């Protein structure tokens, strides 16, 4: 079963040479095993067997295919691979279900043993050698003339060869979609069964005309198909419902793993929670430890189980319809979105759980989901969806027309599906007339975590607290904090904190710092707030 | 013709840059463009033995409904041996009255590329939803967007133009990449004729070389204008001082004492304060200083040229070109073009382009950009609005709040 295709040129990484590892001794039952079998290899079509020339020994042990008990040879090129050049991305990524279209019939030919049908680069075969020591001394060596299991470039090249070989059939048949993954060949179409079946054989024969033997319709695979955790049908895909085990003794690694499989699901079944399981891990001593299980912990597991019951029915992509992407805020920083063309006929759905930094706001976050979704889409449909976002046009308009950073959102449309993302506050663009004016100021001795922070108003109000164990910014912000506290619904606040300026400025509504978060609360609670910044020491005070 | 031997700078290796996902619209376009290109023998499909890769995409040109193929050889260029044989930057077009740009990418295909280097020009046309593996190619000729291309074509270029350079030594012409800048002091009348004239002169040989004007005699830099009100409040004075105190980095002559004194006490911001005659004098001096650009600013070509941009809101945007902070060589403003009524990325992009364009003119050299935007957002859409055969270097940042309020105070 040798194919007549021009081998592709394979060079070993420059400045390096073929392996030199030693063959480790084997039982006598494994020797006579690899022996009586390798003799077939050359008998097949690949002239494999050499002598003292090309001393590139490669390990060749033997392990039985437990379920047959009959030694089928095997090798290890770990070294060779190391010494072989690099090829190009073999599968930059797998096709996601929501991007396939529906078909009348799909088949997959298990072109399994195809690697061995393709001719290896002759000038390279050389760098492939065996060593099957009988039993005693005598200090039985083969090579390769065809792509072998384990070699770095076997798949890469194979795919390509396949690619070339299919090009014609693909053209004479632009109504039949083929898909190559690993050693399988997915084929779909909207032909009437009988027609499909014949093209399939037509093709099956076409491959064989190249030396690629394939299975007859009597021994093939049939839908539904197992994908990325998706159960596939030619008309629909479904989420292979997976249920969590009922455990007597819960271990650390157990939770670690349970919580993982749990998170995966959350994308499909938004409603899943794990905050209370994420808590059984705090302080964990060893991976094999057995943690109790809070009641709040079981109420979650049990409540999650209810959810992961009824599976998920989904439909494929119709190029004819426009793409709709709708989002919702599960909570602070947690978003759920779902793409579809026919309402409720969900194509794809998801959840993003963004963290937090020295400054972020729901609006900005919203923005980040949109960009992700967009990209995701381009990748799957080559198009970007029309968005349905829970923000009011006025809200957006007034925000981005003020943010310091460049930002945009593709064609989108408001959807009053509370809770709506909104601006929790806005600093006044100028001093509020008829308002107290606090001149907050804070200082702390860098090395000795200790300082003071206070204020003084135009109404002659004053205050200063000493702070044991702190830094510069904590105090600054604190000063500000204070001002806000004992101040009233309308306050003007001068401060010289360079860092603080930006922070508050950018209307952040969530931070890492509990202190900053303090400030936010206050800021929200106020009627109107003007915040002003003035240069450092000497002058304004 | 033949082909001169090219190499990578020693030690370096071919770029292995990942292709970003493209929209369908673009994908089909490219596929169409590349098959045709293959037929002509300008490019060839390649195998996996080739591990290299560069990004490509398509952008429609201004006033054109035709998709143009664009590649990002930035990395490759970074790695190809500098040629030293370079291009001489004039200084005239800087001063000229009007300039026009010609796209001479086609000329580059005529000439072939060294066979041992072709491998490095590998690129990949992606498939939607990773349904099929990529369609990989590599150039056979001199590709567009490569630094070597104008270089290896330089000679041929000279003679091509000589008959015009000799017939009109009163007009300037600069070549940079697939671009060609030509400036004349002649009115847009006798000008267009001479450009469309020169245009033909080229079409002659065979290399299709097709608002669209420029005016370098209207941009160089602007002053920082200080407010000037009738009555000044505490806040007003404060802000004012903040700016100056910062400006004192560009002008050390700037004083801010007299003003700062008035600001002594714990007065309400809305409080109105009468200006000290001493203070009024001080301010007068600062106003005077700021009137013109700081002294001692020389363009050193030994060092890179930098470009910062501050979003100022209201479609407004500000920039400064410099090789050393606070010693800008030029600074300017840019008001969005009627179309980006709701698109920040569109604007930014446009901006970026003018600025680079200008650099070329002034110093014939692209600047590295400090863009106030997320890497994510930028890479998702910059391609959707780009329109230039070249691609400047860039990095994303956080606009320091001071610098903006500052240049915001630019001659309006
Ligand atoms: C099990 C899915 O295998 C495949 C993966 C990727 N691509 C193909 C061919 C393309 N087929 C298309 S557009 N639709 C499609 C729909 C349903 C099913 Cl079950 C398989 N393919 C496949 F057949």
Curated annotation (Swiss-Prot), chain B:
Outcome of mutating residue 64 to Y: Confers multi-NRTI resistance
Summarize the impact of residue 63 to S.
Answer: Confers multi-NRTI resistance
Describe the effect of residue 313 to E: Confers resistance to abacavir, lamivudine and zidovudine
Impact noted for substituting residue 204 to K: Confers resistance to lamivudine and zidovudine
Q: What is the effect of changing residue 149 to A?
A: Confers resistance to pyrophosphate analog PFA
Q: Cite the effect that the entry attributes to residue 128 to T.
A: Confers resistance to delavirdine, efavirenz and nevirapine
Per the Swiss-Prot or TrEMBL record, what residue ranges does the short sequence motif Tryptophan repeat motif cover? 378-394
* Result of changing residue 109 to Y: Confers multi-NRTI resistance
Q: Mutating residue 131 to K has which effect?
A: Confers resistance to emivirine
Effect of substituting residue 64 to N = Confers multi-NRTI resistance
Effect in UniProt of substituting residue 65 to N: Confers resistance to lamivudine and stavudine
- According to the UniProt record, what happens if one changes residue 63 to E? Confers multi-NRTI resistance
Give the recorded effect for residue 96 to E.
Answer: Confers resistance to atevirdine
Q: Which domain of life is it from?
A: Viruses
Per UniProt, what does mutating residue 183 to Q do?
A: Confers resistance to efavirenz, HBY 097 and nevirapine
Q: What is the effect of changing residue 183 to C?
A: Confers resistance to efavirenz and nevirapine
Q: What is the effect of changing residue 94 to Q?
A: Confers resistance to efavirenz
Changing residue 313 to D: what effect? Answer: Confers resistance to abacavir, lamivudine and zidovudine
Q: What is the effect of changing residue 181 to C?
A: Confers resistance to nevirapine
UniProt-annotated binding residues for Mg(2+) 1: 103, 178-179
Mutating residue 183 to S leads to what result? Confers resistance to efavirenz and nevirapine
The impact of changing residue 172 to D is: Confers resistance to efavirenz, tivirapine and trovirdine
Sites marked Essential for RT p66/p51 heterodimerization? 381, 394
Instruction: Domain (Reverse transcriptase): give its ranges.
Output: 40-214
Q: What is the effect of changing residue 154 to L?
A: Confers resistance to pyrophosphate analog PFA
What's the protein name? p51 RT
What organism is this sequence from? Human immunodeficiency virus type 1 group M subtype B (isolate HXB2) (HIV-1)
| Entire-sequence positions represented here | 592 to 1019 of 1435
């Amino acid at each position: 079963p040798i194919s007549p295709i021009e081998t592709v040129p394979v060079k070993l990484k420059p400045g390096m040479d073929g392996p030199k590892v030693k063959q480790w001794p084997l039982t006598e039952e494994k020797i006579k095993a690899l022996v009586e079998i390798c003799t077939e290899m050359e008998k097949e079509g690949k002239i494999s067997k050499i002598g003292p020339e090309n001393p590139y020994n490669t390990p060749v042990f033997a392990i039985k295919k437990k379920d047959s008990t009959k030694w089928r040879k095997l090798v290890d090129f770990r070294e060779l691979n190391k010494r072989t050049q690099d090829f190009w991305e073999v599968q930059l990524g797998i096709p996601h279900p929501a991007g396939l279209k529906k078909k009348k019939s799909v088949t997959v030919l298990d072109v399994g043993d195809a690697y061995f049908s393709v001719p290896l680069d002759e000038d390279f075969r050389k760098y492939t050698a065996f060593t099957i020591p009988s039993i005693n001394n005598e200090t039985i060596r083969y090579q390769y003339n065809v792509l072998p299991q384990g070699w770095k470039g076997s798949p890469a090249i194979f795919q390509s060869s396949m690619t070339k070989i299919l090009e014609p059939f693909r053209k004479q048949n632009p109504d039949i979609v083929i898909y190559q993954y690993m050693d399988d060949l997915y084929v779909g179409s909207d032909l009437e069964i009988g027609q499909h079946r014949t093209k399939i054989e037509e093709l099956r024969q076409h491959l064989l005309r190249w030396g690629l033997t394939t299975p007859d319709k009597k021994h093939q695979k049939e839908p539904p198909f197992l994908w990325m955790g998706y159960e596939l049908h030619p008309d629909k895909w479904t989420v292979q419902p997976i249920v969590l085990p009922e455990k007597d003794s819960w271990t650390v690694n157990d939770i670690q793993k349970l919580v993982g499989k749990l998170n995966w699901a959350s994308q499909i079944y938004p409603g899943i929670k794990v905050r209370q399981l994420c808590k059984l891990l705090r302080g964990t001593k060893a991976l094999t430890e057995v943690i109790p299980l809070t009641e709040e912990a079981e109420l979650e597991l049990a409540e999650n189980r209810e959810i992961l019951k009824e599976p998920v029915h989904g439909v494929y992509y119709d190029p004819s319809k426009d793409l709709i992407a709708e989002i919702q805020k599960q909570g602070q920083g947690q978003w759920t979105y779902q793409i579809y063309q026919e309402p409720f006929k969900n194509l794809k759905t998801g959840k993003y759980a963004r963290m937090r930094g020295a400054h972020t706001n729901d609006v900005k976050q919203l923005t980040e989901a949109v960009q992700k979704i967009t990209t995701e889409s381009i990748v799957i449909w080559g198009k970007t969806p029309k968005f349905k976002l829970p923000i009011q046009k006025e809200t957006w308009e007034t925000w981005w027309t003020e943010y310091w950073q460049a930002t945009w959102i593709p064609e989108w449309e408001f959807v009053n599906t509370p809770p709506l993302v909104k601006l929790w506050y806005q600093l006044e663009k100028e001093p509020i007339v008829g308002a107290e004016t606090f001149y907050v100021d804070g200082a702390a001795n860098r090395e000795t975590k200790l300082g003071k922070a206070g204020y003084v108003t135009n109404r002659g109000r004053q205050k200063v607290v000493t702070l044991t164990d702190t830094t510069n910014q904590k105090t600054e912000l604190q000063a500000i904090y204070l001002a806000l506290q004992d101040s009233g619904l309308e306050v003007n606040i001068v401060t010289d904190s360079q860092y603080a300026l930006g922070i508050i400025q950018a209307q952040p509504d969530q931070s890492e710092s509990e202190l900053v978060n303090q400030i936010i609360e206050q800021l929200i609670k106020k009627e109107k707030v003007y915040l002003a910044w003035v240069p450092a020491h000497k002058g304004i005070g | 013709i033949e082909t001169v031997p090219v190499k990578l700078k020693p030690g370096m290796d071919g770029p292995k840059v990942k292709q970003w996902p493209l929209t369908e619209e673009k994908i089909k376009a490219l596929v169409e463009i590349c098959t045709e290109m293959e037929k002509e023998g300008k490019i060839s499909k390649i195998g996996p033995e080739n591990p290299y890769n560069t990004p490509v995409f398509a952008i429609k040109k201004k006033d054109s409904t035709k998709w143009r193929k664009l590649v990002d050889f930035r990395e490759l260029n970074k790695r190809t041996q500098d040629f030293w044989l370079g291009i001489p930057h004039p200084a005239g077009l800087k001063k000229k009255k009007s300039v026009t740009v010609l796209d001479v990418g086609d000329a580059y295909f005529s000439v072939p590329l060294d066979e041992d280097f072709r491998k490095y020009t590998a690129f990949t046309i992606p498939s939607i939803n990773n349904e099929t593996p990529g369609i990989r190619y590599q150039y056979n000729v001199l590709p567009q967007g490569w630094k070597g291309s104008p270089a290896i074509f330089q000679s041929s270029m000279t003679k091509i133009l000589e008959p015009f350079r000799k017939q009109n030594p009163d007009i300037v012409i600069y070549q940079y990449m697939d671009d060609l800048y030509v400036g004349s002091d002649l009115e847009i009348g006798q000008h267009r004729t001479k450009i469309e004239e020169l245009r033909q002169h080229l079409l002659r040989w065979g290399l299709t070389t097709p608002g669209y004007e420029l005016h370098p005699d209207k941009w160089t830099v602007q002053p920082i204008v200080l407010p000037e009100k009738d009555s000044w409040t505490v806040n007003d004075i404060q802000k004012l001082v903040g700016k100056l105190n910062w400006a004192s980095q560009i002008y050390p002559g700037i004083k801010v004492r007299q003003l700062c004194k008035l600001l002594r006490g714990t007065k309400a911001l809305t409080e109105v304060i009468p200006l000290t005659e001493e203070a009024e004098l001080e301010l007068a001096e600062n106003r005077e200083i700021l009137k013109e650009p700081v002294h001692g600013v020389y363009y050193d070509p030994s060092k890179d040229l930098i470009a910062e941009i501050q979003k100022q809101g209201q479609g407004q945007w500000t920039y400064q070109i410099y090789q050393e902070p606070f010693k800008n060589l030029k600074t300017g403003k840019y008001a969005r073009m009627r179309g980006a009524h709701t698109n920040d990325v569109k604007q930014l992009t446009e901006a970026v382009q003018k600025i680079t364009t200008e650099s070329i003119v002034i110093w014939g050299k692209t600047p590295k950009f400090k863009l106030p935007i997320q890497k994510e957002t930028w890479e998702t859409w910059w391609t959707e609005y780009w329109q230039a055969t070249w691609i400047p270097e860039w990095e994303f940042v956080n606009t320091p709040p001071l610098v903006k309020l500052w240049y915001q105070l630019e001659k309006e």
